[PDB]
């Protein structure tokens, strides 16, 4: 029941596996898995893998690569071509599952090639985990009954203080279901959001409605936002939008 | 030349025509034509026609009807079905012309049936030329200042100060107008006007409403965001948005970014 | 004295003059003078004159020209070169008087050339030496019109339209002793014209050399925020180095 | 039906009366009635009356007195004693009835003494007083007809925003006093001078609860601290803004 | 006063006390005392006590309970019945004294019963952080140095301050104020007071946030009316 | 390349020096240098110096003094008389160099007297800037600072008050105090990043643009406060603090032209 029993379950699971490939995103969870894997198995027995793709930003990729490096892991980036799957390309309500399918298939290929006994990810005890289970990836924190409070507890005891505090969210969510994602309109959404964040709005969505951008901001930020209206209008128009709008309902 | 000669040209054209039908909107221009026609020819020699349609509000029609009655004209309301023309229903870039054609075709029928010698409208300084409609203020070289001068001299003080625009302008070209989405746009704009924003547009982008406000009002508007969101969603929009460029985008920008906004708008 | 008596005095004075030139600004006072002149003497015996100059906006000039025509007057624009007078150019407390002198001197020339018996202005009762020295007549003042009598006769004549936002000389944007130049005048005039175009009809761009100090009514400053960057860049393109908003609001100083 | 017909009804009614006393408030409605009475009957057959009282601002009284002269009327100010009636002083939902009673009783006394055939007020269509003729209402004037006829007569000057009876700033069952009335009156006068012509300072003893039109609240923030200190110096302990806005 | 001297001063003081009960609120300060006490004395010689009561939010109790368990302490919740004291119930200007009395009496009773030598708190009943001359900045230095990243960042105050002196506190009106403030915080205003004036709610916000609040005026008016206020108002003077 | 190589370059340089004096301002950069020196060389081999002057707020001098001791350094404050140099006093465009010149002369005097092999400062991307030598950019400073557990540094970054005065304006104790008091007042209202630029009878306030909407409630109090400090007109710069950094690409280019026109 205690953290010590949970940690022990995690330690013994790693020792049994001996050589692992870690799906590393930079979150606290996969940071904890990667640190435990390094401490239990040694740097030559752990491969940290960070996936680059069109649905996530270069900034989050670069941050994860640097964090794995900082922890002392051998880290390798791999590029996924999500738009090659028609379910993802056409953004069906099922697209998340096919992206997860391609993700775990790639990490399995890497693990098969480096002699790893398993792919590990950072899933915990809190569905969407269908793709992981189908590929055989192990969520050791979940197996060891780690809740979020235990992750923080163990991180503190191990002296981990550095991880990515901004949880990534697939850009697919900026597009209505049935809308076709392209290299161009994905980049236009990410470039628009990057500009808005640089203005001091870290929580933002630029929702894509063909010629319309619909900006979602937390409502308590909209009053301050007004000073930027025209600069935002023209910037996002130079990115290719015809109309730049603010959702009166706010973020979500 | 002088105002006096311009009036005399207008009087002489009316005297020659003897019996006229006047396209009356309630604006100052058609108010001047109707007042002049009544003064020169008499009530029994004038028919004022006010057209109702789906592209304009019943409030504007009712005001124009009441204004024509106030002048003492025999008034005839007529209803146009603009949506029966596929150019108008599908909102093509030439949709305005087919509306003009259908408008002047109805007025010609009314004038032919009541023995008028011409249809008159209030245009100043075209489906009208093909229809044979006469714009006597334009023929007599009246500019807007001459209209105002003659109106004041005739003692005309009551007219439509707000020239309202066809609801067609709220729909992108190629979007099909329907009875429901017209009513949706009209009710949304009416609600926003009732909140204290008399200059407003609710542009229709299917499930998105894109609200245009004069930019100096956007700060005041924030207090109403949630009520406007839920109101326009109850009218049938899924998403309710405020255009960051405001109403008449670019007209208030600095020189450089006004040119930039026009370079963008002309790329589209 | 009743309003009818004040009107009859004014009517008799116009009748005696037969033909007049009216200095017309578009304000309610000169609108009343012009309308009465038109009613008593007829449009052919009245010339309305609107003076254009560097110290007042083209918008107020254009409005006054349109208003005089809407009243039914023959109207003539005339341009004064105020900056040719060193008193006006050096922006001293007597500059206004020398401007009035050049104003009425021009109006006298117009009146002599069209056969008018007098120049009329819109002054009423409550710096008029230049008017008196020039022999210009203020018939509203002569007939004991106060501002309430002006409103009453305007109502009786059906006058409802005039310029309610009376313009003041751009010289007030410069501290005393600052030399007015064509360049710095145009800089201030263009800055204020832009700000009015944003929806702020009451505004001052105070000139502090490389600093512009914008005065707005305090109840409007919240509305202004959406325009900060465009106003900043617009006014720098007009030549200012720094574009600022006075926290004290419209006419914050005066002291 | 037409404006001209309603005007003609008004003209005929005035002609029949020959001599009237006009309850004049300075609003557009009583401005139109007063001007029509003067135009049909002449200055010597019209008496304009402006009622001053503790429940309406001295500023509106002064404006109306000046406007009545501007319209061409002989004008008489009269001061009403609303707080001398216990029904009004104790501020019940029936207070309105007793104030109207005293108002029309005074105007009727004035009219009896100058030989008027009636007291006229500015009530319009869209509620009847028996002791006064509301000729605009009898002639079926709507607010739109008042404005159209006003423009046609060249009337442009009237009180555009009536402050209305200060009794509405106090809860029912609260006793009105000269002190608390004065406190509310001075508070609203200050807020109006800042550029908010439509405002209420609702009285909750040590709390002031300010009602502004909601579209004005964003502009108001620049004044928060000055209003707070001013209304505290007038005697409120806490100065607040109602989040619901005006009404 | 190097960090090493201040830490060593505290280390020696804890070591001398052998067995401790920690008044733990979830703030960074009591978080520091608890972590240090556990490290110096061991888990089985430290009991963290978090007080539940009507004058503080259930959210703050749950977070502090969770945070202390997260650090590895044996944690014990205790319930104080503040409203049973007539001074607290009637909200006298002296009520604060009687509240502290029951709090330290309860913690003293807990400590005597489990063999603790003292009750410790996190003030910067002994405050060893205060004795070691800890400022807020050096507390921060040790927190990172010990790997501490989680604590209660918004230290609450007693709900009594929302009522004028002499007002009777009730279960209903406390719940009403507490619910109103929870709603306003959920909108993005972590520093707020809903001051209780019978049928009037008077909201205090930091003055620099009042402009941001306007978008919420109508929802807040109607929300707090459904909680029982007749009028919902914003204090023009701001928070305090 | 990697953060570890950069740290190792820094470690090797400190070991080589053996005894150092650290110019410590309280910024994250000089905090990183000081912590590294202490960890590599030991407390008895490092002296932290915080320079006070008429151009530095006493509050920032105190904060740096407290942070250096907090890190475990022997720390010594010293005051420079910048206003005794006519180039600094009359605020010429070269004032920056003469202030830095007098700064480094004082630190060199201290290092010669304490047996230090060099003076170290926190310069990044005979004074040594070891962070710059080891190729540290701002991202690497933040990353290493996090790794050592550094949590305290001056987040509201000190600049010389001279930057509030136009070139050619004479700095005095009175007008410096006027600027410092105006800025301290604004910080007390909740605006930690602020400049009160001095234009004789005009104060021109620079705020981050995302805060200007919040400022409206304080307009009258700030106007009256700064007038009592001696300004005639109290104004807000419409371009804000660090004008241009947040603009769209076109207008950022435009404002970069405007700024360059006054250089
Ligand atoms: C796992 C996945 C399917 C998304 O599900 P999710 O639970 O929302 O994803 P998370 O971002 O919480 O990632 C969980 C773990 O996956 C791994 N992971 C996620 N993104 C990764 C990346 N780019 N590189 C390597 N590992 C990655 C990590 O081990 C991570 O743990 P952590 O971020 O808590 O430290 C994602 O990997 C994917 O490929 N596509 C996204 C599909 C989606 O949006 N699903 C919605 C859930 S119904
Ligand atoms: C007149 C019309 C043909 C449009 O042309 P337009 O000249 O730009 O439109 P206007 O509104 O200025 O019409 C001018 C005159 O038409 C007449 N008119 C307009 N609407 C009228 C109505 N509902 N009933 C009767 N007459 C009407 C009036 O004489 C009016 O004079 P006014 O200045 O006093 O209002 C219009 O009546 C029509 O049939 N369809 C409008 C569709 C559209 O969008 N047209 C754009 C033109 S670019
Ligand atoms: C009258 C004058 C001599 C100064 O005296 P003043 O009473 O302080 O100035 P005012 O602005 O009140 O002008 C009073 C009258 O002068 C006349 N006047 C003022 N500006 C005028 C102009 N531009 N053209 C014609 N007449 C003008 C009008 O009769 C005006 O009456 P009104 O404005 O009350 O209707 C004035 O003519 C002058 O000096 N300059 C005129 C303004 C100008 O140069 N340009 C345009 C101003 S918008
Ligand atoms: C007029 C009164 C008798 C009540 O009637 P009301 O309809 O509530 O008030 P109104 O403001 O609509 O008054 C209507 C007309 O009364 C006359 N009137 C009102 N106040 C007047 C005053 N101070 N002096 C003279 N006439 C006055 C005017 O003719 C006015 O027309 P106008 O203001 O539209 O131009 C009011 O003056 C009074 O004495 N007491 C009102 C107190 C109250 O609580 N009323 C609640 C009723 S809803
Ligand atoms: C501690 C107490 C007795 C008063 O102290 P205070 O200075 O007002 O409040 P603090 O929150 O600073 O309490 C100091 C320490 O008490 C302890 N403490 C406070 N509330 C606690 C709780 N609910 N459970 C356990 N320990 C608690 C903690 O060690 C805390 O340290 P930290 O908050 O700095 O991390 C208070 O907790 C109490 O029981 N009643 C409040 C009395 C009051 O209203 N006082 C008004 C002051 S004039
Ligand atoms: C050192 C000085 C010259 C600032 O120049 P700088 O090197 O560009 O300034 P930085 O902000 O990069 O600081 C560099 C380092 O100098 C040292 N330093 C600066 N001010 C210091 C002070 N008052 N006391 C001690 N050390 C100080 C610190 O090591 C500092 O590291 P930091 O990044 O944590 O602040 C400054 O002391 C001075 O004399 N004037 C400041 C303004 C100026 O005109 N500078 C000209 C130099 S470009």
Short mmCIF file of C-alpha atoms in Angstrom, two decimals, chain C residues 4-255:
data_model
loop_
_atom_site.label_atom_id
_atom_site.label_comp_id
_atom_site.label_asym_id
_atom_site.label_seq_id
_atom_site.Cartn_x
_atom_site.Cartn_y
_atom_site.Cartn_z
CA UNK C 4 -40.30 89.02 -30.48
CA UNK C 5 -38.80 92.44 -29.72
CA UNK C 6 -35.24 91.14 -30.03
CA UNK C 7 -36.16 89.50 -33.35
CA UNK C 8 -37.83 92.67 -34.66
CA UNK C 9 -34.71 94.69 -33.81
CA UNK C 10 -32.64 92.15 -35.71
CA UNK C 11 -35.06 92.18 -38.68
CA UNK C 12 -34.97 95.99 -38.92
CA UNK C 13 -31.17 96.02 -38.76
CA UNK C 14 -30.94 93.46 -41.57
CA UNK C 15 -33.50 95.37 -43.68
CA UNK C 16 -31.50 98.58 -43.36
CA UNK C 17 -28.31 96.82 -44.46
CA UNK C 18 -29.92 95.37 -47.64
CA UNK C 19 -26.90 93.24 -48.54
CA UNK C 20 -24.55 91.45 -46.15
CA UNK C 21 -21.55 89.18 -45.90
CA UNK C 22 -21.89 86.67 -43.04
CA UNK C 23 -18.83 85.21 -41.28
CA UNK C 24 -20.14 81.64 -40.92
CA UNK C 25 -18.47 79.02 -38.70
CA UNK C 26 -21.31 76.49 -38.49
CA UNK C 27 -21.93 77.27 -34.79
CA UNK C 28 -25.45 77.93 -33.56
CA UNK C 29 -24.84 81.70 -33.32
CA UNK C 30 -23.67 82.32 -36.88
CA UNK C 31 -26.27 79.80 -38.11
CA UNK C 32 -28.95 82.03 -36.58
CA UNK C 33 -27.43 85.16 -38.13
CA UNK C 34 -27.22 83.47 -41.55
CA UNK C 35 -30.77 82.09 -41.40
CA UNK C 36 -32.17 85.48 -40.35
CA UNK C 37 -30.18 87.20 -43.10
CA UNK C 38 -31.62 84.71 -45.59
CA UNK C 39 -35.20 85.15 -44.32
CA UNK C 40 -35.13 88.96 -44.36
CA UNK C 41 -32.97 89.77 -47.40
CA UNK C 42 -33.20 86.71 -49.62
CA UNK C 43 -30.52 84.33 -50.85
CA UNK C 44 -29.33 86.71 -53.62
CA UNK C 45 -28.34 89.45 -51.12
CA UNK C 46 -26.42 87.28 -48.65
CA UNK C 47 -22.96 85.78 -49.06
CA UNK C 48 -21.85 83.25 -46.45
CA UNK C 49 -18.08 83.13 -45.86
CA UNK C 50 -16.17 80.28 -44.18
CA UNK C 51 -12.49 80.91 -43.47
CA UNK C 52 -10.02 78.05 -43.91
CA UNK C 53 -6.60 78.22 -42.21
CA UNK C 54 -3.65 76.23 -40.88
CA UNK C 55 -4.83 76.63 -37.28
CA UNK C 56 -8.20 74.88 -37.78
CA UNK C 57 -9.14 71.51 -39.25
CA UNK C 58 -10.32 70.95 -42.81
CA UNK C 59 -13.12 68.83 -41.31
CA UNK C 60 -14.65 71.80 -39.51
CA UNK C 61 -14.21 73.85 -42.70
CA UNK C 62 -15.93 71.18 -44.79
CA UNK C 63 -18.78 70.87 -42.29
CA UNK C 64 -19.40 74.64 -42.19
CA UNK C 65 -19.38 74.88 -45.99
CA UNK C 66 -21.95 72.05 -46.16
CA UNK C 67 -24.10 73.58 -43.41
CA UNK C 68 -24.31 76.99 -45.07
CA UNK C 69 -25.40 75.38 -48.34
CA UNK C 70 -28.00 73.23 -46.55
CA UNK C 71 -29.45 76.41 -45.08
CA UNK C 72 -29.88 77.72 -48.61
CA UNK C 73 -27.03 80.26 -48.66
CA UNK C 74 -24.58 81.07 -51.39
CA UNK C 75 -21.32 80.21 -49.63
CA UNK C 76 -17.70 81.08 -50.39
CA UNK C 77 -14.59 79.60 -48.80
CA UNK C 78 -11.57 81.81 -48.14
CA UNK C 79 -8.09 80.79 -46.93
CA UNK C 80 -6.15 82.87 -44.41
CA UNK C 81 -2.37 82.64 -43.97
CA UNK C 82 -2.17 83.18 -40.22
CA UNK C 83 1.46 82.05 -40.00
CA UNK C 84 2.48 85.10 -42.03
CA UNK C 85 1.85 87.26 -38.91
CA UNK C 86 4.78 87.10 -36.47
CA UNK C 87 2.48 87.50 -33.46
CA UNK C 88 0.58 84.36 -34.43
CA UNK C 89 3.71 82.43 -35.47
CA UNK C 90 5.38 83.14 -32.10
CA UNK C 91 2.31 81.95 -30.15
CA UNK C 92 1.98 84.74 -27.58
CA UNK C 93 -1.13 85.65 -25.57
CA UNK C 94 -2.03 88.38 -28.10
CA UNK C 95 -1.81 86.05 -31.14
CA UNK C 96 -5.58 85.58 -31.20
CA UNK C 97 -6.10 89.32 -31.65
CA UNK C 98 -3.79 89.48 -34.67
CA UNK C 99 -5.58 86.49 -36.17
CA UNK C 100 -8.91 88.26 -35.68
CA UNK C 101 -7.46 91.30 -37.44
CA UNK C 102 -6.42 89.30 -40.51
CA UNK C 103 -9.75 87.45 -40.44
CA UNK C 104 -11.87 90.62 -40.44
CA UNK C 105 -9.57 92.37 -42.92
CA UNK C 106 -10.13 89.53 -45.37
CA UNK C 107 -13.90 89.64 -44.77
CA UNK C 108 -13.93 93.39 -45.44
CA UNK C 109 -12.21 92.83 -48.80
CA UNK C 110 -14.84 90.23 -49.75
CA UNK C 111 -17.64 92.55 -48.68
CA UNK C 112 -16.23 95.49 -50.63
CA UNK C 113 -15.93 93.30 -53.72
CA UNK C 114 -19.51 91.97 -53.58
CA UNK C 115 -21.24 95.21 -52.55
CA UNK C 116 -22.24 94.17 -49.03
CA UNK C 117 -23.01 96.97 -46.61
CA UNK C 118 -21.52 95.08 -43.66
CA UNK C 119 -19.70 92.05 -42.33
CA UNK C 120 -21.80 90.15 -39.81
CA UNK C 121 -20.49 87.67 -37.26
CA UNK C 122 -22.23 85.55 -34.64
CA UNK C 123 -21.14 87.28 -31.43
CA UNK C 124 -23.67 87.51 -28.60
CA UNK C 125 -23.86 89.03 -25.11
CA UNK C 126 -22.90 87.54 -21.73
CA UNK C 127 -11.16 90.27 -27.49
CA UNK C 128 -13.57 92.12 -29.80
CA UNK C 129 -11.39 95.19 -30.50
CA UNK C 130 -10.39 93.71 -33.86
CA UNK C 131 -14.07 93.33 -34.79
CA UNK C 132 -14.82 96.92 -33.77
CA UNK C 133 -11.68 98.35 -35.39
CA UNK C 134 -12.75 96.59 -38.62
CA UNK C 135 -16.34 97.91 -38.49
CA UNK C 136 -17.88 94.41 -38.36
CA UNK C 137 -21.38 94.13 -36.83
CA UNK C 138 -22.58 91.57 -34.25
CA UNK C 139 -26.33 92.02 -34.63
CA UNK C 140 -27.17 89.30 -32.10
CA UNK C 141 -25.16 91.21 -29.49
CA UNK C 142 -26.70 94.55 -30.53
CA UNK C 143 -30.22 93.12 -30.13
CA UNK C 144 -29.48 91.83 -26.55
CA UNK C 145 -29.38 88.13 -27.52
CA UNK C 146 -28.02 85.81 -24.83
CA UNK C 147 -27.38 82.12 -25.48
CA UNK C 148 -30.87 81.26 -24.24
CA UNK C 149 -32.39 83.74 -26.71
CA UNK C 150 -30.29 82.17 -29.47
CA UNK C 151 -31.71 78.74 -28.63
CA UNK C 152 -35.28 80.06 -28.52
CA UNK C 153 -35.13 81.84 -31.89
CA UNK C 154 -33.33 78.83 -33.42
CA UNK C 155 -36.18 76.62 -32.23
CA UNK C 156 -38.76 79.06 -33.63
CA UNK C 157 -37.00 79.04 -37.00
CA UNK C 158 -36.76 75.26 -37.05
CA UNK C 159 -32.97 75.22 -36.96
CA UNK C 160 -31.87 71.85 -35.51
CA UNK C 161 -28.51 71.27 -37.22
CA UNK C 162 -25.28 73.05 -36.37
CA UNK C 163 -21.76 72.16 -35.34
CA UNK C 164 -22.00 71.47 -31.61
CA UNK C 165 -18.31 70.59 -31.13
CA UNK C 166 -16.69 74.00 -31.56
CA UNK C 167 -13.09 73.75 -32.76
CA UNK C 168 -10.25 75.58 -31.03
CA UNK C 169 -6.99 76.81 -32.53
CA UNK C 170 -4.19 74.22 -32.83
CA UNK C 171 -1.95 76.85 -31.22
CA UNK C 172 -3.25 75.58 -27.85
CA UNK C 173 -1.30 72.35 -28.43
CA UNK C 174 1.99 74.25 -28.14
CA UNK C 175 3.39 75.88 -24.96
CA UNK C 176 3.63 79.67 -25.04
CA UNK C 177 6.78 80.83 -26.77
CA UNK C 178 7.02 77.72 -28.92
CA UNK C 179 7.32 78.79 -32.53
CA UNK C 180 4.58 77.44 -34.73
CA UNK C 181 5.88 75.99 -37.99
CA UNK C 182 4.13 74.40 -40.91
CA UNK C 183 5.78 71.10 -40.02
CA UNK C 184 4.86 70.88 -36.37
CA UNK C 185 1.31 72.14 -37.07
CA UNK C 186 0.76 69.45 -39.72
CA UNK C 187 2.20 66.90 -37.31
CA UNK C 188 -0.31 67.81 -34.61
CA UNK C 189 -3.22 68.19 -37.03
CA UNK C 190 -2.59 64.78 -38.64
CA UNK C 191 -2.19 63.11 -35.22
CA UNK C 192 -5.50 64.50 -33.96
CA UNK C 193 -7.27 63.69 -37.22
CA UNK C 194 -6.19 60.07 -36.89
CA UNK C 195 -7.36 59.88 -33.24
CA UNK C 196 -10.76 61.35 -34.11
CA UNK C 197 -11.08 58.76 -36.86
CA UNK C 198 -10.84 56.06 -34.18
CA UNK C 199 -13.99 57.33 -32.43
CA UNK C 200 -12.62 59.97 -29.99
CA UNK C 201 -14.06 63.36 -31.10
CA UNK C 202 -12.63 65.10 -28.01
CA UNK C 203 -8.84 64.75 -28.00
CA UNK C 204 -5.67 66.83 -27.84
CA UNK C 205 -2.20 65.92 -29.07
CA UNK C 206 -0.01 68.16 -26.95
CA UNK C 207 3.34 68.97 -28.54
CA UNK C 208 6.42 68.45 -26.37
CA UNK C 209 8.96 68.42 -29.20
CA UNK C 210 9.86 64.73 -29.67
CA UNK C 211 7.10 63.66 -27.23
CA UNK C 212 3.42 63.65 -28.09
CA UNK C 213 1.20 63.78 -24.99
CA UNK C 214 -2.34 62.61 -25.80
CA UNK C 215 -5.19 63.98 -23.68
CA UNK C 216 -8.47 62.00 -23.72
CA UNK C 217 -11.54 62.35 -21.48
CA UNK C 218 -10.92 59.92 -18.66
CA UNK C 219 -14.17 58.01 -19.27
CA UNK C 220 -12.85 57.10 -22.75
CA UNK C 221 -9.35 55.80 -21.87
CA UNK C 222 -10.48 52.21 -21.31
CA UNK C 223 -11.89 52.19 -24.85
CA UNK C 224 -8.51 53.35 -26.20
CA UNK C 225 -6.47 50.25 -25.30
CA UNK C 226 -7.30 48.39 -28.53
CA UNK C 227 -5.68 51.26 -30.49
CA UNK C 228 -2.42 51.65 -28.48
CA UNK C 229 -0.04 50.08 -31.01
CA UNK C 230 -1.63 51.66 -34.09
CA UNK C 231 -1.62 55.11 -32.46
CA UNK C 232 1.97 54.61 -31.26
CA UNK C 233 3.20 53.70 -34.75
CA UNK C 234 0.99 56.18 -36.64
CA UNK C 235 2.25 59.12 -34.61
CA UNK C 236 5.89 58.02 -34.82
CA UNK C 237 5.46 57.93 -38.59
CA UNK C 238 4.29 61.55 -38.26
CA UNK C 239 7.67 62.31 -36.65
CA UNK C 240 7.28 61.91 -32.88
CA UNK C 241 9.88 59.88 -31.03
CA UNK C 242 7.59 59.00 -28.08
CA UNK C 243 3.80 58.64 -28.04
CA UNK C 244 2.25 58.90 -24.59
CA UNK C 245 -1.17 59.08 -22.92
CA UNK C 246 -1.63 61.68 -20.17
CA UNK C 247 -2.82 59.88 -17.04
CA UNK C 248 -4.59 63.06 -15.96
CA UNK C 249 -6.92 63.03 -18.96
CA UNK C 250 -8.34 65.78 -21.12
CA UNK C 251 -7.08 69.23 -20.09
CA UNK C 252 -5.12 67.58 -17.28
CA UNK C 253 -2.77 70.52 -16.94
CA UNK C 254 -3.96 74.07 -17.57
CA UNK C 255 -1.49 74.69 -14.71
#
